[PDB]
Design a protein around this ligand. Structure first.
Ligand SMILES: COC(=O)C[C@@H](NC(=O)[C@@H](NC(=O)[C@@H](/N=C1/NCC(=O)N2CC[C@@H](C)[C@H]2C(=O)N[C@@H](C(C)C)C(=O)N[C@H]1C(C)(C)C)C(C)(C)C)[C@@H](C)c1ccccc1)c1nccs1
Length: 253
């Protein structure tokens, strides 16, 4: 792997790795309490042996610049972070894959960037969501304080998350956990749109998801394809991420 840095629209440095390959260029977008190490740890990366893989750390996570404000964590800023990565590698065609909120990011990048030929959203749908201000602020307080990593660890353990997902939370600065959480009140509630007719949009979730309605809504509204994995919940579906990688590799082939 090679490392890269790019600068987002607002000056934030965005750092990542490039794993060269002869195949399609795939850009990987992690979730809120994660960093780019999840792709190797989950087995997703080994499922794409031929692809040119680009994996960034979103702002405030991993090796990328610190933010520390809620508006700095607005959805539009993460979209700018990903588009900067698309600029550095100069391709006309990219396939994006995002986990959890990273899926929402990938969908929004697809809406605005005609270089995105495919976008895959793992365990996130594309529809409008009502965000309860009070509960999100409460969660920001929990995650940003001294007990914040333990709060997330305990929650994800108790819901059967894979170990890599449990462990990743402790690698995120508590101040950025709080700011990213508050950032969800700045634009993340809106639905995403289709960027252009030829785009391939894929949503992935647990067959046991308690709320499949918005996933079906995306099939209808966006012409998205819905992929199911065997799991009772979205968190547990993350145990199937390597398997999903193999299915992505079948599309890219
Ligand atoms: C139903 O969702 C689940 O089954 C768990 C699942 N979450 C999500 O799919 C989505 N979100 C949510 O549904 C709600 N949102 C929350 N908090 C905002 C939020 O998400 N976070 C703040 C901390 C950060 C780790 C992240 C998170 O995970 N928090 C958990 C908490 C229980 C540990 C958490 O969901 N809390 C809740 C409350 C309200 C209880 C505080 C909502 C409807 C208000 C948007 C994410 C992907 C998203 C955010 C914005 C736009 C669209 C989607 C995940 N499992 C692992 C990673 S994401």
């Amino acid at each position: 792997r090679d490392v890269f840095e790019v600068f987002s629209r607002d000056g934030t440095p965005i750092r990542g790795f490039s794993r060269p390959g002869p195949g399609e260029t795939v850009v990987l977008v992690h979730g809120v309490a994660m960093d780019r190490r999840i792709w190797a740890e989950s087995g997703f990366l080994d499922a794409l042996p031929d692809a040119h893989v680009l994996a960034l750390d979103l702002r405030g996570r991993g090796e990328s610049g610190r933010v520390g404000t809620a508006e700095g964590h607005a959805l539009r800023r993460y979209v700018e972070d990903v588009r900067a990565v698309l600029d550095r590698f100069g391709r006309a065609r990219y396939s994006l894959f995002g986990t959890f909120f990273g899926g929402r990011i990938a969908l929004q990048v697809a809406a605005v960037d005609t270089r995105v030929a495919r976008a895959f959203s793992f365990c996130a749908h594309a529809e409008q969501v009502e965000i309860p201000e009070d509960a999100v602020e409460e969660e920001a307080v929990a995650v940003e304080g001294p007990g914040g990593h333990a709060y997330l660890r305990d929650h994800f353990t108790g819901r059967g998350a894979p170990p890599w997902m449990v462990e990743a939370c402790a690698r995120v600065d508590p101040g950025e956990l709080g700011a990213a959480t508050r950032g969800l009140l700045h634009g993340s509630d809106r639905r995403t749109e289709r960027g252009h007719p030829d785009q391939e949009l894929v949503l992935i979730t647990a067959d046991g998801d308690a709320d499949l309605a918005p996933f079906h809504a995306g099939e209808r509204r966006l012409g998205a394809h819905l992929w199911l994995v065997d799991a009772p919940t979205r968190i547990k579906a993350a145990g199937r991420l390597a398997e999903v990688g193999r299915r992505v590799a079948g599309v890219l082939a």
